[PDB]
Design a protein around this ligand. Structure first.
Ligand SMILES: Cn1nc(C(=O)NCCc2ccc(S(C)(=O)=O)cc2)c2ccccc21
Ligand SMILES: [Zn+2]
Length: 140
């Protein structure tokens, strides 16, 4: 679990969004595993605006933050896991690292701020849903 709190927005994994998130929906895209809802209180996170390929991510299944190199956001075939079937996911970045389903929502960050959130994993890779192209998170 986990979310990004930027301005009056809450960014979560679409597959983990709550009824309150859907009832206060700003934007969602199933192909990216992202959902954005509106909040009453403002948040403290800053979104990175950059093309970094190195950063640090939080892994809840290890209680640890790990430094990683990751690929640029791409359309990737995600293999079937125990709870979800094989499917294509867009704006996804991959790194070599540990992840389990419950790690989704952990932040990946670079020197410029939040890059994305853990969204996929398996075969020793962790995938992050990018948020750096969502420029509107910075206003209104
Ligand atoms: C980190 N990590 N995550 C997963 C995982 O299954 N994520 C769900 C991926 C997912 C995205 C979008 C939808 S949608 C919006 O199309 O319904 C459903 C599912 C995973 C598995 C195995 C090891 C690691 C893992
Ligand atoms: Zn950066």
């Amino acid at each position: 679990s986990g979310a990004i709190y930027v301005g009056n927005y809450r960014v979560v994994n679409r597959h983990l969004a709550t009824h309150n998130d859907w009832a206060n929906l700003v934007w969602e895209d199933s192909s990216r595993d992202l959902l954005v809802s509106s909040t009453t209180a403002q948040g403290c996170d800053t979104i990175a605006r950059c093309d970094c390929q190195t950063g640090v991510y939080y892994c809840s299944s290890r209680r640890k933050h790990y430094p990683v190199s990751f690929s640029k956001p791409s359309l990737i075939f995600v293999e079937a896991s125990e709870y979800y079937p094989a499917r294509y996911q867009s704006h996804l970045m991959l790194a070599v690292g540990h992840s389990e389903p419950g790690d989704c929502g952990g932040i990946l960050r670079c020197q410029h701020g939040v890059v994305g959130i853990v969204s996929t994993g398996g075969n020793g890779l962790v995938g992050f849903a990018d948020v750096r192209d969502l420029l509107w998170l910075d206003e209104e």
